[PDB]
Design a protein around this ligand. Structure first.
Ligand SMILES: Cc1n[nH]c(C)c1CNC1CCCCC1
Length: 435
C-alpha cells in the first residue's frame, strides 16, 4: 500500500480491527522504509485511543489530548483532521508527507472533506501515497454491513417528542442504549422524558463531546442521547441502538443565507455507522438495532461541500494550482475551482474569523470577501428586519463594544449561530467584541 502514486481504501467492516490491529502494522512498515508519515484522527477521544494501540512506537502527538514526553526521534506525526487543514491555511510550513493515513475517513465536516481533497490531489500528481480507513466510503449503498456477531434489525416507529403511551419497548429494556437524534434541542426533550421515568441519561454533541464522553466510563448510565458526532469511532459497552434515521441539513438559499433544513433521512453511510456501535463483541450475539425511517442521498447540495471548496481555494498547492475534491464526492456541489480565492489580506481575515471567531466557514467567507476587518463588528447590527435573531420568542439583545444596547440583526444570516442556547451565547459574545 505504501508505494508512491497510490491511494488505497481500507474498507474492512465495523469492528474488524482497522485501528488496533492494522494501523500499528502500517506504522511499523513506514518507519522501516523511512517514510515521513501523518496519521489523522477525527476527534481528540479517538486520538487518545490511538496512543493506546500505538504504545511503544515512536509517534509524535501534536495534540493536548495525550500527555507524552517526546524524544525528538519521530518521523510519524499524529493530529486531528481539523488541525491538519488549519495548519495548511495558516502561514506555517506543513511537511510534504510521503504517507498520509486518514482514520474514520467517512467524516463529512468541512475540514475533513478539505483534507481528503488536498491529499488525493497530491497522490494524483505522483507525489505521495495515501490510505483512507473506513467501512463506509463515499457513495456506499449498504446500510447493513457485516459485524463481529449477529444483530437483530427491526423497523419500528421511534419517538421524536416526549410521550405518554405507545412505546413500552423503549423503557421496558434492562440493558444500555445509544440513541441517535437529529439535533441538540430534540435530544433535550427526549432526555427530559426519560429522566422523568427514572432513567439515568448522558447527552453528547460536538461542543460537549470530550467532557461528557468520559461520563460513559466514570458513572452508571441507562441511555446515551447523541447527535451524529458519535458516528466517528466512539465506542460504548451497550446492547442496543435506537436510530431515528434523521439529521439536519445546512442549505445555502440564493447565495444569501444559510438555513437548517429538515429533519430529513440520513445517508446509507451514516445509518451503517450508527448501527455499527453494536454487534462488536463476537462473544455477545443478539444486540438490537431499532430504526425509525429510510435512507436517502441528503449529502447532495449540503453546504459542507461548498464550504470545503472555500477552504481548498485558499490553500497553496503549487503556483496557481488548486486542489480538487476527492473524486467519489466531487459531484455533491456545483462549483468552479478557484471561484473563492481571496487576496492576501482578505485570506488572513477569513482564517482569523474561523480560528478565533469560531464562525461557520460560509459566514466567515461573506465577511472577509466584503473587505471587512476581523475586529469590525458593525455588520452584526445593520441587517434587515427579517434577519433579527430571536431569543425565547423575543429579539436577542447585546451591549456593543461602544456601550450601546442593540438588537442582534446580522447583514448575513446563518442559522448555525443560533441552533442551540450555547451557539447563540457564543455569537452574542462575538457581536459584543469579547473575542
Ligand atoms: C469502564 C466502562 N466502560 N463502560 C462502562 C459501562 C464501564 C464501567 N464503568 C463503571 C463506573 C461505575 C463503577 C463500576 C464501573
Amino acid at each position: 500500500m505504501l508505494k508512491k502514486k497510490q491511494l488505497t481504501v481500507l474498507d474492512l467492516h465495523p469492528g474488524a480491527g482497522k485501528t488496533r490491529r492494522v494501523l500499528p502494522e502500517i506504522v511499523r512498515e513506514a518507519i522501516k522504509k523511512r517514510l515521513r508519515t501523518v496519521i489523522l484522527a477525527p476527534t481528540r477521544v479517538v486520538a487518545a485511543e490511538m496512543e493506546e494501540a500505538l504504545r511503544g512506537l515512536p509517534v509524535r502527538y501534536m495534540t493536548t489530548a495525550v500527555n507524552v514526553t517526546h524524544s525528538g526521534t519521530e518521523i510519524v506525526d499524529l493530529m486531528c483532521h481539523a488541525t491538519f487543514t488549519s495548519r495548511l491555511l495558516q502561514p506555517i510550513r506543513v511537511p510534504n508527507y510521503n504517507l498520509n493515513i486518514m482514520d474514520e475517513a467517512h467524516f463529512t465536516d468541512p475540514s475533513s472533506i478539505a483534507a481528503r481533497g488536498y491529499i488525493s490531489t497530491r497522490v494524483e500528481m505522483g507525489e505521495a501515497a495515501a490510505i483512507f480507513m473506513t467501512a463506509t466510503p463515499p457513495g456506499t449503498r449498504d446500510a447493513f454491513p457485516d459485524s463481529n456477531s449477529p444483530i437483530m434489525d427491526t423497523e419500528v416507529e421511534v419517538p421524536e417528542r416526549a410521550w405518554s403511551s405507545g412505546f413500552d419497548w423503549v423503557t421496558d429494556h434492562s440493558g444500555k442504549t445509544v440513541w441517535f437524534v437529529p439535533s441538540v434541542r430534540n435530544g433535550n426533550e427526549i432526555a427530559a422524558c426519560l429522566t422523568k421515568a427514572g432513567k439515568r441519561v448522558i447527552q453528547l454533541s460536538r461542543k460537549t463531546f470530550e467532557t461528557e464522553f468520559q461520563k460513559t466510563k466514570n458513572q452508571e448510565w441507562d441511555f446515551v442521547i447523541t447527535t451524529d458526532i458519535s458516528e466517528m469511532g466512539a465506542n460504548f459497552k451497550a446492547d442496543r441502538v435506537i436510530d431515528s434515521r434523521r439529521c439536519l441539513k445546512p442549505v445555502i438559499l440564493d447565495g444569501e443565507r444559510v438555513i437548517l433544513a429538515g429533519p430529513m433521512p440520513v445517508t446509507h453511510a451514516s445509518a451503517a455507522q450508527r448501527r455499527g456501535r453494536i454487534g462488536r463483541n463476537p462473544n455477545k450475539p443478539g444486540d438490537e438495532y431499532m430504526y425509525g425511517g429510510g435512507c436517502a442521498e441528503t449529502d447532495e447540495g449540503h453546504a459542507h461541500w461548498l464550504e470545503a471548496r472555500m477552504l481548498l481555494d485558499n490553500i497553496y498547492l503549487q503556483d496557481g494550482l488548486i486542489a480538487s475534491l476527492y473524486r467519489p464526492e466531487a459531484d455533491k456541489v456545483a462549483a468552479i475551482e478557484g471561484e473563492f480565492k481571496l487576496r492576501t489580506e482578505q485570506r488572513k481575515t477569513f482564517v482569523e474569523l474561523m480560528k478565533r471567531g469560531d464562525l461557520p466557514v460560509w459566514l466567515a467567507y461573506q465577511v472577509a470577501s466584503a473587505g471587512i476587518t476581523y475586529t469590525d463588528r458593525r455588520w452584526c447590527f445593520d441587517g434587515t428586519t427579517n434577519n433579527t435573531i430571536m431569543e425565547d420568542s423575543v429579539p436577542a439583545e447585546v451591549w456593543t463594544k461602544y456601550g450601546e444596547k442593540r438588537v442582534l440583526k446580522p447583514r448575513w444570516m446563518d442559522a448555525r449561530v443560533c441552533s442551540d442556547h450555547a451557539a447563540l451565547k457564543s455569537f452574542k459574545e462575538f457581536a459584543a467584541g469579547k473575542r
